[PDB]
Amino acid sequence: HKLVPLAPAPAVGQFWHVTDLHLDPTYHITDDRTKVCASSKGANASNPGPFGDVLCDSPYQLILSAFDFIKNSGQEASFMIWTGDSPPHVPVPELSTGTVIKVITNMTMTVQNLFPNLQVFPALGNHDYWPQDQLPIVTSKVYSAVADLWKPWLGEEAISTLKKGGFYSQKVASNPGLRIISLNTNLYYGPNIMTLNKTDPANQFEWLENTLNSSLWNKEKVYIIAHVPVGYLPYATDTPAIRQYYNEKLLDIFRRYSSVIAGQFYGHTHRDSLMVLSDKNGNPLNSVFVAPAVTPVKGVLQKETNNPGVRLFQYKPGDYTLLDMVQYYLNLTEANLKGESNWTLEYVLTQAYSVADLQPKSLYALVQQFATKDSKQFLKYYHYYFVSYDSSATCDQHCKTLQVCAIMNLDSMSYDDCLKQHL
Ligand SMILES: *[C@@H]1O[C@H](CO[C@@H]2O[C@@H](C)[C@@H](O)[C@@H](O)[C@@H]2O)[C@@H](O[C@@H]2O[C@H](CO)[C@@H](O)[C@H](O)[C@H]2NC(C)=O)[C@H](O)[C@H]1NC(C)=O
Ligand SMILES: *[C@@H]1O[C@H](CO)[C@@H](O[C@@H]2O[C@H](CO)[C@@H](O)[C@H](O)[C@H]2NC(C)=O)[C@H](O)[C@H]1NC(C)=O
Ligand SMILES: *[C@@H]1O[C@H](CO)[C@@H](O[C@@H]2O[C@H](CO)[C@@H](O)[C@H](O)[C@H]2NC(C)=O)[C@H](O)[C@H]1NC(C)=O
Ligand SMILES: *[C@@H]1O[C@H](CO)[C@@H](O)[C@H](O)[C@H]1NC(C)=O
Ligand SMILES: *[C@@H]1O[C@H](CO)[C@@H](O)[C@H](O)[C@H]1NC(C)=O
Ligand SMILES: [Zn+2]
Ligand SMILES: [Zn+2]
């Protein structure tokens, strides 16, 4: 037979996920530690170095080290997802629309300059707007500016919806049959006073339903990406990450389409968390991966924070089932002491937890293990939750119940049931 595609001589696809870069262009080592970074809001940086400080957002040197690590890692990857939050945590009057656009431009061009051939799928974060959190339900300067910045990666239809509402879907050029849906979940975030009481802000739910329907009929698989996740904040009691009304509506769509959705990937929490979306009777439907931040920032009172992280997913080519996740990190104290970075493997999920893959069943069974008393699996998970920032951090019985309940129960009814039974 002539002119047949050439067969291979077990291939695995891979993609990167980076999030919550939070560049602080003010960062510099100075004798007066209240002047190291505007993101410390006048507190003395604790022990600052070239790669940052726990009381500061990311120096450019830290962000560049993360992307240089990716570039030089020897990992092949066919795309990258980037789930938002580029400007630093400074007060509203210290920023502006133009300043926000300048920072997002810097990060976008850093990526485009270092990875000219790599398609990247961004999502907007709640800090990717001026004033922060107030992302609107109609077009805006920011939405237009990111549409221009991200045009190398996005087709006409995606640019159109991004300009209008901050969301889009896009085919993955290197992966026929895979579509990325990039939601603007900041429309559902509590502090957003521009969307209070709207049943379908920016018509994103209607759009999402229609997009998933078309993916079904076009035999596509979907990865969902967004900044703010669904479900419950695992360190708090009964505090959904987005407003309850919206969390419930979004989860209803995700459950119904859970056979088309092969992955969900979020940021915002600056922590390494898992969730398993199940139906009301506890049949696992969809795996959810919240990635930790590059920035190590924390407030003055907060007891723990994260080390900087970036992560890589492995998936089945042409099928898009998730096979593994490799979490990398920077030991910030180690890097700052010597002045050179050593981005390094934190863990491989299948090896760390002795699971076969990232399918909902495999993670659902793992979390049953977490729940057993003195589970070594949960102890490891809690260490990884802060990206190995503090091995002596402990999670008492109340803390663990809040964590496990949030991992397994993404809707209000299931979550409440879990707390009533175990708290
Ligand atoms: C769900 O999608 C089907 C399929 O529609 C087509 O296939 C998609 C992959 C995409 O290419 C769409 O643009 C296509 O229209 C919808 O069924 C079609 O609906 C149109 C009217 O809008 C009708 O003229 C066609 O005959 C329908 N085709 C079939 C096979 O039924 C369907 O309406 C969508 N459902 C919902 C609830 O949105
Ligand atoms: C993004 O911003 C950084 C600095 O905020 C720019 O970097 C300057 O030059 C080198 C590398 O180009 C940095 O290490 C320095 O920190 C920066 N200079 C000064 C005086 O601080 C970088 O060029 C910007 N990138 C883009 C694409 O705009
Ligand atoms: C990151 O690097 C720091 C500094 O090297 C490590 O700090 C060690 O912390 C343990 C307690 O957790 C101490 O007993 C050691 O003496 C410290 N080592 C040094 C050389 O100071 C820290 O453990 C590292 N983080 C990880 C996850 O390995
Ligand atoms: C910062 O640290 C120095 C100690 O070297 C101290 O004199 C100064 O008052 C501190 N400022 C604040 C706000 O903690
Ligand atoms: C809007 O407010 C009313 C009453 O305050 C409430 O019944 C309704 O569910 C709210 N809608 C949304 C989308 O929050
Ligand atoms: Zn953030
Ligand atoms: Zn955020």
Domains (range + CATH), the chain: 13-421 (3.60.21.10)
Task: Give CA separation, 60 vs 24, 86, 87, 106, in Å.
Answer: 7, 11, 12, 10
**What is the C-alpha radius of gyration for the chain, rounded to an integer number of angstroms?**
21
Torsion of CA 373, 379, 382, 387, to 10 degrees: -170
Q: Which residues are annotated as a binding site for ATP?
A: 89, 126-127, 235
| Residue the block writes with tokens 């990039």 | 182
> Which ligand sits closest to the CA of 386?
3
Residues within a 6 A CB radius of ligand 5: 197, 199, 245
Task: Give CA separation, 311 vs 15, 206, 263, 289, 324, in Å.
Answer: 9, 31, 15, 11, 11
Residue type, 276: V
Which residue among 30, 31, 32, 33 is best mutated to probe the pocket of ligand 4, counting the most ligand atoms within 8 A of its Cβ?
33
Instruction: For residue 318, give every residue at least 6 positions away whose Cβ sits within 8 Å of its Cβ, in sequence order, or none.
Output: 175, 176, 177
Instruction: For residue 130, give every residue at least 6 positions away whose Cβ sits within 8 Å of its Cβ, in sequence order, or none.
Output: 92, 95, 96, 97, 99, 100, 142
Q: Is 186 exposed, middle or buried (0-12, 13-18, 19+ CB in 10 A)?
A: buried
* Other beta carbons within 10 Å of 222: 20
Omega within 30 of 0 (cis) for the link into 317: no
**Ligand 1: which residue has its CA nearest to atom 11?**
214
Which residue among 197, 243, 248 is best mutated to probe the pocket of ligand 5, counting the most ligand atoms within 8 A of its Cβ?
197
Instruction: For residue 299, give every residue at least 6 positions away whose Cβ sits within 8 Å of its Cβ, in sequence order, or none.
Output: none
3-class SS of residue 99: helix
Cβ of 333 closer than 6 Å to ligand 3, yes or no, is yes
Alpha helices in 238-342, H assignment, sequence order? 244-256, 332-338
CA 50 to ligand 3 centroid distance, Å: 19
| Residue the block writes with tokens 């696809």 | 13
Pick the atom of ligand 4 nearest to 43's CA. 13
Cβ of 259 closer than 6 Å to ligand 4, yes or no, is no
> Cα separation of 222 and 286, whole Å?
12
Q: Give the distance, in angstroms, between the CA of residue 304 and the centroid of all CA atoms in the same chain.
A: 19
CA 233 to ligand 3 centroid distance, Å: 29
> Cα separation of 402 and 217, whole Å?
39
3-class SS of residue 81: strand
CA 48 to ligand 4 centroid distance, Å: 14
Torsion of CA 22, 25, 30, 34, to 10 degrees: -60
> Cα separation of 201 and 193, whole Å?
12
> Which ligand sits closest to the CA of 335?
3
* Other beta carbons within 10 Å of 214: 13
> Cα separation of 398 and 376, whole Å?
17
Task: Give CA separation, 232 vs 276, 277, 371, in Å.
Answer: 12, 12, 17
| Residue the block writes with tokens 């002539």 | 2
- CA 130, 131, 134, 137 dihedral sign is negative
Q: 266, 228 in Cβ contact below 8 A?
A: yes
- CA 262, 266, 272, 275 dihedral sign is negative
What angle, 0 to 180 degrees and rounded to 10, lies between the N-to-C axes of helices 60-72 and 97-114? 30
CA 44 to ligand 4 centroid distance, Å: 6
> Cα separation of 85 and 315, whole Å?
26
> Cα separation of 390 and 302, whole Å?
13
Pick the atom of ligand 1 nearest to 213's CA. 1
DSSP state of 368: H
Q: 103, 142 in Cβ contact below 8 A?
A: no
Q: Which of 239, 259, 298, 279 is nearest to 364 (CA)?
A: 279
> Cα separation of 55 and 51, whole Å?
12
SS percent in the chain: helix, strand, coil, step 5: 35, 15, 50
Helices and strands counted in the chain (H then E): 12, 12
Q: 253, 212 in Cβ contact below 8 A?
A: yes
289 has which bridge partners? 265, 274
Question: Which residue spans within 61-165 are E strands per DSSP?
Answer: 79-82, 119-122
CA 110 to ligand 2 centroid distance, Å: 10
Residues near ligand 6 ion, CB 5 Å cutoff: 20, 85
Q: Which of 74, 73, 52, 75 is nearest to 62 (CA)?
A: 52
49 has which bridge partners? 52
> Which ligand sits closest to the CA of 307?
3
Cβ of 133 closer than 6 Å to ligand 3, yes or no, is no
Residue type, 198: K
Q: 370, 399 in Cβ contact below 8 A?
A: no
Instruction: For residue 78, give every residue at least 6 positions away whose Cβ sits within 8 Å of its Cβ, in sequence order, or none.
Output: 13, 14, 15, 118, 119, 172, 174, 175
Cβ of 196 closer than 6 Å to ligand 1, yes or no, is no
Q: 380, 352 in Cβ contact below 8 A?
A: yes
Q: Is 340 exposed, middle or buried (0-12, 13-18, 19+ CB in 10 A)?
A: exposed
Q: 124, 146 in Cβ contact below 8 A?
A: yes
Pick the atom of ligand 1 nearest to 216's CA. 9
CA 199 to ligand 5 centroid distance, Å: 8
**Ligand 5: which residue has its CA nearest to atom 3?**
197
Angle at 333 between CA 330 and CA 339, to 5 degrees: 85
CA 226 to ligand 1 centroid distance, Å: 26
**Ligand 3: which residue has its CA nearest to atom 1?**
331
> Cα separation of 419 and 423, whole Å?
5
| Residue the block writes with tokens 């051939």 | 117
Structure's resolution in angstroms: 1.5
Method by which the coordinates were obtained: X-ray
CA 65 to ligand 5 centroid distance, Å: 46
